[PDB]
Design a protein around this ligand. Structure first.
Ligand SMILES: COc1ccc(NC(=S)NCCCn2ccnc2)cc1OC
Length: 325
């Protein structure tokens, strides 16, 4: 049916501003350097990455919560901590942007997972920092909508991927939020026709970023439910190219990352436990996966920086349009 929130197209002025990248490049890369380290569950470096995310966002005055638990894995008992940052906690509805911050425990050697998902992690923090002034202003409106960032732990399997060996953080969080009962009267400015029975119902849409940072990603609409949101991404990308704001190999090329079609493809990722509970999902993951996927070549040098800049523009423009920044 109709998307529950009427989606006001970004004014041209705001598109142009959101599509300028300065020192902006430099800020993003400084943030990204913090994630370009092996961050296997249980490791000191995983703890330091978690602490980095927490601190970056508390420094921005967001409410930051940690959903920590121990879970049984094929390698024994393991500590997991999801990181959840919420710009305005009392706001009824959340635009949720997500990724995972653990890296695969690769048996062949040290695995950085630069695309998987150091880049998405950085892009989330970079969004919060670069939009901070606008976000802090949006937060005072009392409009019932806010931004939330979720950095999932334990997305990767320890051994062969299975329903029980994967998605530890997201399975746990989806459950916890689902059983956490609330209602519209308890919350600030829920939309009129809202059915809120628990926390999971406040996730207006979850936008899941995964495997980003390689050249020329090809995205598709994986979910009919979120097709009106996906199309804003298509449209935004299109206007940025019209504006001449996309970095390309040659003059007169256009990016076409967001395909205006849909694929029949099923990808298991951190969205799955939320999908089962009726959260609308936009799955921003390329198909095919990057060539470096789950190989030791998923490292800093194999990242494509102009694509990353282009994506950052699309995401900033998108969040600006959704929250009307
Ligand atoms: C090599 O190409 C593929 C291999 C496997 C699958 N199918 C699934 S369900 N993979 C699990 C995805 C979870 N995940 C999260 C982060 N990194 C991986 C699809 C692929 O290309 C479309």
């Amino acid at each position: 049916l109709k998307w529950p929130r009427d989606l006001r197209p970004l004014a041209h002025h705001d598109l142009l501003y959101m599509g300028q990248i300065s020192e902006d490049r430099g800020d993003f890369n400084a943030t990204l350097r913090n994630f370009l380290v092996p961050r296997v569950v249980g490791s000191q470096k995983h703890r330091e990455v978690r602490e980095f995310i927490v601190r970056s966002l508390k420094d921005l005055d967001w409410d930051v919560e940690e959903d920590c638990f121990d879970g049984q894995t094929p390698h024994g008992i393991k500590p997991f901590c999801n990181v959840i940052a919420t710009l305005n906690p009392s706001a009824c509805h959340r635009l949720v942007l997500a990724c995972h911050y653990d890296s695969l425990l690769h048996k062949e050697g040290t695995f950085i997972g630069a695309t998987d998902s150091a880049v998405p992690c950085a892009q989330l923090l970079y969004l919060a920092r670069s939009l901070n002034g606008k976000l802090q202003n949006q937060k005072t409106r009392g409009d019932g909508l806010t931004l939330q960032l979720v950095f999932f732990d334990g997305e990767e399997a320890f051994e062969r991927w299975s329903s029980h060996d994967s998605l530890y953080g997201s399975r746990h969080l989806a459950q916890k939020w689902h059983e956490d009962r609330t209602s519209a009267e308890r919350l600030e400015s829920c939309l009129e026709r809202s059915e809120i029975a628990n926390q999971i119902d406040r996730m207006e849409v979850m936008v899941l970023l995964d495997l980003l940072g390689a050249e020329n990603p090809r995205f598709y609409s994986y979910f009919g439910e979120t097709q009106p949101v996906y199309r804003r991404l298509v449209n935004i990308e299109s206007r940025l190219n019209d504006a001449g704001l996309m970095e390309l190999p040659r003059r007169r090329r256009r990016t076409n990352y967001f395909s205006n079609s849909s694929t029949v493809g099923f990808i298991e990722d951190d969205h799955i436990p939320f999908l089962k509970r009726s959260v609308p999902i936009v799955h921003i993951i390329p198909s095919p996966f990057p060539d470096v996927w789950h190989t030791l070549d998923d490292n800093e040098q194999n990242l494509h920086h102009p694509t990353i800049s282009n994506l950052n523009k699309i995401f900033k423009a998108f969040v600006s349009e959704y929250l009307q920044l």
